Design an enzyme around this catalytic site. Structure first.
Site, PDB file in Angstrom:
ATOM      1  N   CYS B 152       0.741  -1.162   0.035  1.00 24.84           N
ATOM      2  CA  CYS B 152       0.028   0.100   0.076  1.00 24.84           C
ATOM      3  C   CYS B 152       0.818   1.501   0.073  1.00 24.84           C
ATOM      4  O   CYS B 152       0.301   2.439  -0.658  1.00 24.84           O
ATOM      5  CB  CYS B 152      -0.950   0.025   1.313  1.00 24.84           C
ATOM      6  SG  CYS B 152      -0.636  -0.482   2.748  1.00 24.84           S
ATOM      7  N   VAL B 156      -0.356   3.967  -2.608  1.00 20.61           N
ATOM      8  CA  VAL B 156      -0.588   5.427  -2.575  1.00 20.61           C
ATOM      9  C   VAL B 156       0.314   6.387  -3.081  1.00 20.61           C
ATOM     10  O   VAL B 156      -0.257   7.282  -3.156  1.00 20.61           O
ATOM     11  CB  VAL B 156      -0.509   5.524  -0.764  1.00 20.61           C
ATOM     12  CG1 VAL B 156      -0.516   6.939  -0.173  1.00 20.61           C
ATOM     13  CG2 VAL B 156      -1.682   4.697  -0.348  1.00 20.61           C
TER      14      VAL B 156
HETATM   15  S1  CLF Z   1       5.032  -2.160   6.264  1.00 19.04           S
HETATM   16 FE1  CLF Z   1       3.964  -2.672   8.157  1.00 19.04          FE
HETATM   17  S2  CLF Z   1       2.915  -4.575   7.792  1.00 19.04           S
HETATM   18 FE2  CLF Z   1       3.237  -3.613   5.821  1.00 19.04          FE
HETATM   19  S3  CLF Z   1       1.209  -2.423   5.144  1.00 19.04           S
HETATM   20 FE3  CLF Z   1       2.887  -1.153   6.265  1.00 19.04          FE
HETATM   21  S4  CLF Z   1       2.323  -1.027   8.684  1.00 19.04           S
HETATM   22 FE4  CLF Z   1       1.655  -2.772   7.347  1.00 19.04          FE
HETATM   23 FE5  CLF Z   1      -0.481  -4.120   5.731  1.00 19.04          FE
HETATM   24  S5  CLF Z   1      -2.392  -3.611   4.246  1.00 19.04           S
HETATM   25 FE6  CLF Z   1      -1.192  -5.453   3.454  1.00 19.04          FE
HETATM   26  S6  CLF Z   1       0.422  -6.067   4.934  1.00 19.04           S
HETATM   27 FE7  CLF Z   1       1.314  -4.310   3.681  1.00 19.04          FE
HETATM   28  S7  CLF Z   1      -0.014  -4.367   1.767  1.00 19.04           S
HETATM   29 FE8  CLF Z   1      -0.746  -2.868   3.269  1.00 19.04          FE
END
Ligand code: CLF
Ligand code: CFM
Ligand code: CFM
Ligand code: CLF
Ligand SMILES: [Ca+2]
Ligand SMILES: [Ca+2]
Lengths: 468, 522, 522, 467
Positions: B152, B156
């Site tokens: 994401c 984004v």
């Molecule tokens: S580095 Fe850490 S785990 Fe990653 S997203 Fe970012 S806060 Fe979370 Fe989340 S929803 Fe899926 S697992 Fe990612 S692509 Fe986004």
């Protein structure tokens, strides 16, 4: 020794493109090493993110608050009940640790922002979970990138409901690892929770009030630590995070001493408690008989003669027990060699416990440690052993192929690789669903677990008899 | 305290008196806990119809979801190709999580990399990350292909995957002809199954969009099989088994079953089996392409039809008796192969099991969840067994799917008391099994927390969980099972009858109380 | 009373207050029941080591046996040959029982006839019964062969089966060339397995003995496999699968897997598949004969060696890792066929499951029972898993077997707490699981009453049953499983780790009490 | 119907050798039949033996006594917990019904006799099971053939231990089916148990004491019968065999009326209590509302005004309940045709329950019934329905193929045959692990069960879409 290991390091590094080779060389050492820097792209780092450090490890254990994984559905889902931070409570009504609460961002929330949605869900959390004692909102990657202000939503709604709502900016893109998540989380406690009892005189402190800082109670580890402290006479007013309640955290301003188990995650808030409240803090180790003995004595020394007698009582009171454990298990584990790789404490803190069963740690390294942790590590490690900061997949496999350890202690993404190679593996983050490993009762379980796995019948069976 | 001959792990250690005492003191002083009577009161309130109506009014809070995010699916799709490294362009936290989640389900290594985009890349883009990332990955792990998806953060900030890969080729970081398909996979759109769809259409497009001039629909006389997001090894296996015993030439496109099941023989194999690049390039020449899980392969359908010009058969997931029959006959039609005597016998052996077990299965009530194709196939087979699918939840299901399933329900007397819920989660389902108690839940391991809650209300309110789905983390090796075909039907039927009978035996195990009905023969 | 929309069967109907009152009135008014406190006292006494001492001193009384009689095995052997009718010469009550006992386990038709010897035959012999019996069966049921066995009545009155069958051919009741092999199968000598051995020896002698003058050991280049008493369909099927995988020519002599699994397609098939008479005639010409379950095939061994001149290999039942390895290598040797890549992978996938599950299996204590070969293989495999086979019971085992198993136990650290019991039964075992409580029992459905007894002493003393064996009557379709080969070892491993984990989840399902250890991931 | 059934019978008989053909011809009739003759060898009779009738059905249900399957291990192993004769008790302490006690004869016992072994195991039974209230030794085939005298041992040991030990010579070679086992068992009750309280004035009898004779409580059948009679003011002193205790049997001589459900298995002991104690007996039927109502009416008429009125109350109470049952299920079962083959009672006794659901029984037959059972049967069946005594496997399969019933009700050895041919099958011995089917409550479960099986979706799927 030295030349052998240095030859190994250079050989492994020769697969890299130059930029990566020059950087990785700086992170591999024989005891000189750097740590806490960005991971080289494409090299299969074992590290996680700042969200993992804040929601996964510091905040998530606090049982009576609801922790919101704010952003898309992934993060909260992969971290639901993954860490075994044990708690006593009725989950879903008064305690909420194993639940996954999320604002599940869809495109409309990315394009227009999720602040009104955070407000609406705080209302809903309040409707459906009345007995909650506070809310924290753990930001995931999109929240800061899209320009939301979770701080206004927290103090507006918090004011509107007389409830502690902590905004935490632990978006996964911040920092280089779970490490900065710990710090962001320590600052979020400092700014929105720790000062709440500052005008309160209602707590009867005693000369023996203490708090365990940085024991997340993996498999009950804080509970097997605590018992020994109170059997030594001390009163543990707070357990930071493991089976933690928010009132315990608010009460930590009244203790006489802070007992820091996990330095890397908790040192930040300890140093602060010392500056703002004069409360001193000290580090200890409750892994293995030697270290727990050494630690109970060091803590007791800082109190007086009664507690020192009680400490020596406790030591006699368990000497039958841990001596039976080494008698049974040490002949079975003598001179076996372990290679370790865990987060930011356990890579040096379990060395003595292995040595109490006569095993030698021939390699250890950390995912996200800083140089002060390595300072601490070189005292514990043998001359000429291998050190690796943020090891890549490739490097750990090649190091193990040449070092040939008898046991490897690391995480779930490493477990099944080494078991296929024929090497005994124990998970040193989740304790492979066993544990506690802390204290003397923990030592018993630890010792049984290393033996059942290192000496398991299945390891003799990897080669087919017709291909002998 | 510990006995060196009888060491207690956490359970039962903390039941020992001194710990029970120690935890009692900790609570009462420091925890400032709400009193037990209030706790109990609130708990009874959460089991009520009153609570349920408020819970179902949630617009903004999701509690205990029953879906994951797009890149998880793309990684699983990517692992199905020969010597391919999954690569998620964006922040590394995601990859640590994706690998752990699958590691836990399969109890196997799961290899995937990240190019580790940080705060810096959020202001300036992740091009250098893609450049050094690809180069580093190719040299270090030596894949024949790198399949790129996104987290994401990268979505984004709007990184153009195509340009970034093209500039890595231009700038010499990876060979112009090294295979780098991509797909954008936003976590805020759809779910993990959407991620698998996007990644598959990306790899399909990469290998065929240019070469279309020499493609003759039918010339290699094979049928293409696209599996969708699949986490049971037995399912990949049974499709191949049945097509081979039918003598049908086929190409399973994205086949992870060897990488997810290597032998423990002294070696770790990063890569194993998988669909070859050659198969993806030759795939337009197949007679047709069958989509095993159609409801999350929409983009792939549009591409296979619109560019390969294949008339994709309208077939449902081959689950249950009727949909495995429809599947084998459509395959017969296209291949010109008869359905062999061995498969006719197997069908009959499944029908035989149905006749032997019907009196115990009849009218049994189930609450169930999972992905859209899985759930409708489970619904279909439950109705064919004479059971009632009372609560059907699919968090990532859509309005057209809910119509399709309501039409399946409508066609059976056994569907009369069933309701389909899309966009709902497992805390919603917790209320439905309280207020309209079924006999069993069929679900993944997150359902254990619902069973513990129903048990707390009382033994006669406990709804047992029957573990079928993804993820299953608290049992071992169920990822080896089959849910598709006659074989999968035989396994589900045996798990259901036997869960019913094990429940009956625990209820009649009371000496001189209930054991008058603790029969030897059932 | 019944409520027509929720009709109650016996459980829970008789729990309704009016029924509960009526049953209390019945005992108090007319049963002269011993007071409950006396009952409780005697129940606690039956769990003690004192009761155990007395229990183990029994010489004449057998309570809850773990064996059945010889003709039951003879019928199962007969059923494995092509279009043959099992015929038991003697009293008909026996056939109604043999048929029902297998009907309940396979949930299938089990065809078998009797020649209804009555009171009169007890004084004058059963010759006319054989004469009319054979003719009637051949005419009505049209078998290509009739396999004659015996009930205890016909044994005690000493009927010469050979004379009677020859006199039926003499008098023209059945044609001279019609195959009527026979075996004397006395219920008072050994058990069901002995009847299988006696019957097979009988059939092998019938097609072979007077034909040996042209048999060249080796000319058909096959290996014969003799399964022994076998009640899991998956076992006949896995042995055939493995030999075909190795390209090995084989002859499975007595193969009932088709007749014990016909399809439900609108018609009943009385006969199906089975070993052909031609395979039995040609069986001397094989390279060698392997006995899959040698401890109950001694008479067949003596005959195959003595008359067929085959050097039967010293092989244990192919159960568990080591013994499936030995099996495969001996087959390789005899046939000159290399053990293929597929079986090497499969072996390593079993070893992989072992590495993944070893922490939950380590040191788990088991009580188990069954037939001698089944038991020793299960003992071997439990030792390979790092478990402790603490109470090993085999009612129908013999002294030399007991010695062989104590040897296997002596060769492992995990055998140190184990004891082998021959000639003992399930009421003996009931004592042993109260006084030296294991974690689980591995047995057949009769074990459910021992689990019910342990639960009555209390939850902490309940020993759960894992149903593996014969007969399994209170669960459906478990007769389809496999216990032999790497496949069977994979199934048993999965069943053991998951029985451990289900029990662990039941103990940690207490809200705020034990659920601290109610882990999502295990 | 009419001569289609007649030609069908000679069609089927054409396969037999002449002796078998001539005999079997007399055992097949159109509603005229000979019964309780021996079975012809090799024709796969469904019959069992005298041991099955004595141990399996009469003595085995008696809760607090221990029953010894005396002889080799087979007989008692295959009968272990096979019949669902339900009981309330603590098994292995005061009740023993699901246990298998045997003398496990090995060759030395055959060659030298098991009487010494019998005395030893009686002592063992006494040390290890002190709360047992009596023992019965059920002789398997070898005991008579061998020349043992279990009577001597029973008198001696009974004497010594002050224990009721019943010798039962029910060896499987006796008689032609489990029917003679019922008779041997009734005579063993007579000779060794029923007379024990003859001088006991001590039982406070009332005018309303009744005993249920011949209900073995399958799935709780006797319990749903008992409750109705009790609600009608009667007192049931005894339940013969199902959930029965030995004291209930020793007290049965004090009752005012013996209510016989299973005529075949227990008319022998009823005739005896009539001759010796003057107790009258009457037959009744508790399968389906119609039969249960006229049986309650007939039993009530045997007493005084109060009981006639309590009877009318009971009938009025269950009226809404059994009527809701028929309202839900008869429109589902209407006009469906059933073929039955069971043992000695239920082939005639369940017809009324089927008719209460609008179903018709187009064929019925018995394994071991005698001609007085068929006289009773003819009153219940339609003209031209098929009657078959001791049917062979072949004949049943052929009759079913011709008549094509919508449902077949028979035993476990028949079940899977007809299910593979696609005919709905319900087990009419064990109630396919469901039941009770007796009384008003049993009718609800019966109706539900016939429906779930006859109308199950699985029966439409037996033929593959491609053939
Ligand atoms: S580095 Fe850490 S785990 Fe990653 S997203 Fe970012 S806060 Fe979370 Fe989340 S929803 Fe899926 S697992 Fe990612 S692509 Fe986004
Ligand atoms: S990897 Fe501890 S600094 Fe942190 S989850 Fe494990 S080695 Fe963490 S000791 Fe702890 S409880 Fe940990 S085991 Fe410090 S808390 S971010 Mo993974
Ligand atoms: S087959 Fe009853 S005379 Fe006897 S065991 Fe069944 S139709 Fe018997 S009603 Fe009864 S309870 Fe029976 S069902 Fe007379 S007792 S020898 Mo098989
Ligand atoms: S007709 Fe009846 S069941 Fe038959 S034996 Fe005779 S009493 Fe008994 Fe027994 S042990 Fe086995 S089953 Fe027989 S051959 Fe002997
Ligand atoms: Ca694995
Ligand atoms: Ca069947």
């Amino acid at each position: 020794s030295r030349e052998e290991v240095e030859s190994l390091i250079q050989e492994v590094l020769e697969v890299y493109p130059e930029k990566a080779r020059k950087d990785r060389n700086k992170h591999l050492a024989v005891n000189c090493i750097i740590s806490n820097k960005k991971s080289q792209p494409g090299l299969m780092t074992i590290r996680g993110c700042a969200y993992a450090g804040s929601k996964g490890v510091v905040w998530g254990p606090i049982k009576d608050m609801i922790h919101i994984s704010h952003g898309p559905v992934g993060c909260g889902q992969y971290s639901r009940a993954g860490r075994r931070n044990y708690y006593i409570g009725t989950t879903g009504v008064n305690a909420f640790v194993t639940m996954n609460f999320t604002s599940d961002f869809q495109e409309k929330d990315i394009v227009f922002g999720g602040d009104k949605k955070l407000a609406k869900l705080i209302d809903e959390v309040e409707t459906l979970f009345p007995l909650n004692k506070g809310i924290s909102v753990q930001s995931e990657c999109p929240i800061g990138l899209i320009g939301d202000d979770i701080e206004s939503v927290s103090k507006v709604k918090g004011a509107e409901l007389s409830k502690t709502i902590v905004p935490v900016r632990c978006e996964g893109f911040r920092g280089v690892s779970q490490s900065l998540g710990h710090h962001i989380a320590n600052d979020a406690v400092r700014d929105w929770v720790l000062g709440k009892r500052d005008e309160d005189t209602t707590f009867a402190s005693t000369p023996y009030d203490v708090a365990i800082i940085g024991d997340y109670n993996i498999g009950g580890d804080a509970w097997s630590s605590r018992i020994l402290l109170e059997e030594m006479g001390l009163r543990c007013v707070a357990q930071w995070s493991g089976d933690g309640s928010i009132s315990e955290i608010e009460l930590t301003p009244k203790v006489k001493l802070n007992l820091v188990h996990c330095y890397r995650s908790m040192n930040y808030i300890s140093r602060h408690m010392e500056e703002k409240y004069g409360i001193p803090w000290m580090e200890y180790n409750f892994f293995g008989p030697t270290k727990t003995i050494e630690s109970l004595r060091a803590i007791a020394a800082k109190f007086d003669e009664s507690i020192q007698k009680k400490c020596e009582e406790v030591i006699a009171k368990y000497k039958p027990e841990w001596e039976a454990v080494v008698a049974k298990y040490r002949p079975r584990l003598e001179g076996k060699r372990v290679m370790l790789y865990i987060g930011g404490l356990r890579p040096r803190h379990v060395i003595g416990a292995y040595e109490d069963l006569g095993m030698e740690v021939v390699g250890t390294g950390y995912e996200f440690a800083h140089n002060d942790d390595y300072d601490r590590t070189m005292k514990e490690m043998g001359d000429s052993t291998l050190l690796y900061d943020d090891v890549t997949g490739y490097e750990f496999e090649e190091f193990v192929k040449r070092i040939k350890p008898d046991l490897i202690g690391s995480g779930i993404k490493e477990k099944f690789i080494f078991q296929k190679m024929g090497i005994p593996f124990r998970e040193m983050h989740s304790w492979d669903y066993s544990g506690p490993y802390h204290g003397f009762d923990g030592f018993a379980i630890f010792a049984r677990d290393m033996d059942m796995t290192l000496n398991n019948p299945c390891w003799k069976k990897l080669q087919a008899p017709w291909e002998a | 305290s510990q006995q060196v001959d009888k060491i207690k792990a956490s359970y039962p250690l903390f039941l020992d008196q001194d710990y029970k005492d120690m935890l009692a003191k900790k609570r009462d002083g420091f925890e400032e806990k709400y009193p037990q009577d209030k706790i109990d009161e609130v708990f009874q309130w959460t089991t009520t119809k009153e609570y349920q109506e408020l819970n179902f009014q949630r617009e903004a809070l999701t509690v205990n979801p029953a879906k994951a995010c797009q890149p998880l699916g793309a990684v699983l799709c990517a692992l199905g190709f020969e010597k391919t490294m999954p690569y998620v362009h964006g922040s590394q936290g995601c990859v640590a999580y994706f690998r752990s989640y699958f590691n836990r389900h399969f109890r196997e290594p799961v290899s995937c990399v990240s190019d580790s985009m940080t705060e810096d890349a959020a202001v300036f883009g992740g091009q250098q990350n893609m450049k050094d990332g690809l180069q580093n990955c190719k040299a270090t792990y030596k894949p024949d292909m790198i399949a790129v998806s996104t987290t994401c953060m990268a979505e984004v900030i709007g990184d153009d995957l195509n340009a970034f890969i093209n500039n890595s080729k231009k700038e010499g970081f990876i060979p112009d002809e090294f295979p780098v398909p991509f797909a954008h996979t936003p976590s805020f759109v759809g779910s993990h199954v959407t991620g698998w769809d996007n990644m598959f259409e990306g790899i399909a497009r990469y290998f065929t969009l240019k070469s279309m001039d020499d493609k003759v629909v039918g010339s290699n006389k094979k049928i293409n099989i696209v599996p969708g997001f699949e986490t049971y090894l037995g399912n990949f296996r049974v499709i191949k088994r049945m097509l081979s015993e039918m003598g049908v030439g086929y190409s399973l496109l994205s086949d992870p079953e060897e990488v997810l099941d290597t032998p423990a023989d002294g070696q770790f194999r990063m890569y194993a089996g998988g669909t070859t690049q050659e198969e993806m390039k030759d795939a337009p020449n197949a007679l047709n392409t069958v989509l095993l899980q159609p409801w999350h392969l929409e983009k792939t359908k549009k591409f296979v039809e619109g560019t390969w010009k294949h008339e994709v058969p309208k077939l449902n997931i081959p689950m249950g008796l009727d949909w495995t029959d429809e599947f084998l006959m459509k395959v017969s039609e296209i291949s010109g192969q008869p359905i062999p005597a061995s498969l006719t016998k197997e069908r009959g052996r499944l029908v035989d099991m149905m006749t032997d077990s019907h009196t115990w299965l009849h009218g049994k009530r189930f609450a169930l969840w999972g992905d859209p194709d899985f759930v409708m196939g489970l619904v279909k087979f439950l109705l064919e067994l004479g059971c009632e699918p009372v609560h059907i939840l699919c968090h990532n299901g859509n309005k057209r799917w809910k119509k399709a399933v309501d039409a399946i329900l409508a066609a059976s007397p056994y569907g009369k008391n069933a309701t389909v819920y899309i966009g709902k989660d497992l805390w919603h389902l917790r209320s439905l099994v309280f207020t309209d108690k079924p006999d069993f839940m069929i679900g993944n391991s997150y359902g254990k927390f619902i069973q513990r809650d129903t048990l707390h209300k009382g033994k006669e309110f406990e709804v047992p969980l029957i573990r079928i789905g993804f993820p299953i983390f608290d049992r071992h090796h169920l990822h080896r099972s089959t849910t598709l075909g006659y074989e999968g039907a035989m396994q589900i039927l045996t798990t259901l009858v036997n869960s019913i009978l094990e429940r009956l035996d625990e209820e009649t195990r009371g000496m001189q109380a209930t054991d008058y009905n603790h029969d030897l023969v059932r």
